[PDB]
Symmetry: none
Subunit: 354 residues, 3 copies
């Protein structure tokens, strides 16, 4: 019942300023932190040898897009490798991002591991020596981090154990980050896999987020110095019943209003499989939802921002401008969506049953 | 409400058989898993410099004592380095341990780290890639592991968070070990640091263990395939009030009977700074306590089994036989103590009666 | 991290002594705490009007059975009404029970109530004014109480909420009881209904019991001064797979060894609708199970001890002797069962 301040007024201030910059009006996050494992699938999809040079050139392609993306990208999440790579001009990628007004972020988890005794459920590792890594990363240009936990809806999941364990590990990770000046982005992703309907996802999301925030509270986490990266509340991929973006938005916002304390600075949704347009439309619907939303509701997209750019590139250097144009467009479309000003046009423009 | 078997019957049998072998009647554990930075302080206290060879020699000195320790030692806990070292005859240390009827154990935690928002409290790290390490250690002769969490008694400690967190990580560690055929030794140590009395320590111990076993249940841990390494219940190192060995034994067994399920194959106490003699006398009293004890109550001493040995070695090869003799004597004493058959003499020396206390013991 | 003594050494001694006397070697508990509406079905099956008088006579019939039951009965659970009734000779029932070497118990819960948001799960009520009630019952001859929580094995049950809430209310009830010198018997009954097998039941029993003991620890319960009344681990009623009494015994003892601290003074299994014979045979098997059991393993039977006695009685006073002979016989059988010496007429890792 006694307070033992984990952070000083100055440390809190720094964390809060960073979190706010990442989600400033009209800004979102570019999820370009794909590990060498997932980046292999990306490069293969366009027939491109997964070499370090190719990965650099590709990340360089997104990071050096023209100034149009500046007011769109509040932050960029990088994989360890990329954080130390440089642009052709010799500029460290973190410097590239900063000079364009973006905050640098780094993925710090070490993947999921199987939770024994459960039906295929997992937790996430990566806490060992995390404090030293954050201290280094901070010094090397990063101001926020990313840790991903994965939960799945099934006949017996998310189980009590999975919810509790994942919520606890996220708290530990957030705790270590704040001690090192790094704003932690809490990502408790509930996969969309399955044939469950919309209200099933809203139910599970509500229970998961409540556990997450109780856990952050127990570990004395400074909420204003954090961000939330959840799944939007949608029906299962295999769900036979169909819904409208207004329904998805109402369910999403409702689930958040019931669990996410207003102190949390911002919600940066993950696209989790949605098409580039789908992710933008849904995001726009969420911001236009007629309910009180006390936190920024923006994006933290990977493929929803890179899909077209990746294909337009095809690994061919002569397609650089074409590939960047595609990315720029998604950045602009999502910049409008996170403000609710999105339209297929472009720059020119109950709840009791939940 | 639905069982998703973590272990097959065959896996359980292997874990259960391993755990029982380690704490078979009359047998205990030698804790020689001190980290390079910890063992360095030991060798330093005897004018010996911390070098790979010195560390090897000392461990060999302990692991190759005469066949008299065989009945006394059920298992030996080693640090990563020692596990891959060899004896003068070329035999890997794990092989030496087995040839003497002992089970090989390995420490897998990566030390404690501070918990933000608390008053100097910690939790322990070491889960990352633990599964793969356990599979490798298993292949290299290890059958059980050890992980150490440290809690302290103070005005606001252990806190709710500290207790919950430490219990949860121990459970995660235990879960990964059993998935790799390794018996996890759960060590939730409550330091003796402080001036609190016996009942203060009994209360804290009961809360800690209750929390430990609820977490182990939550994580689907096979208790029969585990061992517990708790602190004995004693007053603070700086406590003014005095207690008899019978009182410490009563408080200890009472605390355990109130929190440890009968399924737990055994309890292997840490010496925690108690003198070699004091550690043996209490273990003896514990086993003589007039209460029902559904689990083996033995030792897992680090300091309490090496105080005299180190001093007798002093870092000189010619003192090899002398140092080993001191080790064998402590092991023999403790072998009896865990059977309630230990009766002090007067040959242990002043070394066995010396306090081995170390503030916030880290290793 | 600081202790605030809930009980004094004297209070602990009293509770501990009461707990031990109830489950002393060979002794068990007669569960005769059926309420008016709960006993209605019994009397109906024997065309006996449910009046206070017939209930008094029926209870008198059991409580005054000959001295052969004395070493068999360590305690008798009474319903409020009965605690205040007297035998024909004018002796209050509590006196009768105590004269025969038994301890008097009293049911204190006020029934189960539905837990909203769940698939038909419940919690139990009865905490309101419980302290005042315990002090009064203690003064009126009672030394232990009974409070029943019910859980069911289903598709989504027992859920985390059901488990947590029932564990918590049980702890509150235990806490209040111990403050009034009453030994609380903790009863987290997992119904046998359903088609689940033996493994399903064992798993749920283990999770439920683990939750019960954590709650008890959190509420500072003196375990030595308590008793546990759990369901035996058995397959569901609609289970097609069949098992031997040695198997359910192994599953029962294994579940208990993994969750019940040795400090608990005793385990008094509930009959849970099993037949008089099945309940006895199972308890016997449980006691013969080749595993270490650090607590007494006895009974707390209702119909398992009354079934034949009730039919023999039939509401006819001239049947007094025949009916008592039936109860006495089951009391003798179960006394032998909790000692593993009853006849109908190594650690296994497969659990």
């Amino acid at each position: 019942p006694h307070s033992h301040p984990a952070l000083t007024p100055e440390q809190k201030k720094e964390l809060s300023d960073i979190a706010h910059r990442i989600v400033a009006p009209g800004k979102g996050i570019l999820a370009a932190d794909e590990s060498t494992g997932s980046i292999a699938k990306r490069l293969q999809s366009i027939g491109t040898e997964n070499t370090e040079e190719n990965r650099r050139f590709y990340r360089q392609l997104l990071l050096t897009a023209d100034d149009r993306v500046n007011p769109c990208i509040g932050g960029v999440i990088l994989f360890h490798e990329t954080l130390y790579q440089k642009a052709d001009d010799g500029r460290p990628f973190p410097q590239v991002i900063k000079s364009k007004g973006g905050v640098v972020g780094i993925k710090v988890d070490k993947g999921v591991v199987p939770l024994a005794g459960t039906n295929g459920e997992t937790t996430t590792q990566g806490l060992d020596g995390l404090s030293e890594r954050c201290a280094q990363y901070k010094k090397d240009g990063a101001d926020f981090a990313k840790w991903r936990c994965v939960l799945k809806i099934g006949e017996h999941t998310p189980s009590a154990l999975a919810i509790m364990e994942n919520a606890n590990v996220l708290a530990r990770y957030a705790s270590i980050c704040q001690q090192n000046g790094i704003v932690p982005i809490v990502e408790p992703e509930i996969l969309p896999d399955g044939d469950h309907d919309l209200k099933r996802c809203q139910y599970v999301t509500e229970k998961v987020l409540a556990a997450v925030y109780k856990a952050l509270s127990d570990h004395h986490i400074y909420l204003e110095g954090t961000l939330l990266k959840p799944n939007m509340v949608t029906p299962g991929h295999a769900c036979t019943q169909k819904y409208s973006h207004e329904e998805i938005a109402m369910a999403t916002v409702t689930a958040l209003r019931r669990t996410v304390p207003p102190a949390v600075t911002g919600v940066t949704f993950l696209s989790g499989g949605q098409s580039e347009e789908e992710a933008s439309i849904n995001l726009n619907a969420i911001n236009k939802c007629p309910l009180l939303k006390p936190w920024a509701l923006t994006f933290s997209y990977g493929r929803a921002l890179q899909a077209s750019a990746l294909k337009a590139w095809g690994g061919k250097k002569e397609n650089l401008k074409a590939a960047q144009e595609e990315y720029v467009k998604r950045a602009l479309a999502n910049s409008l969506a996170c403000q609710g000003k999105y339209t297929p046009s472009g720059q020119a423009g109950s709840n009791h049953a939940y």
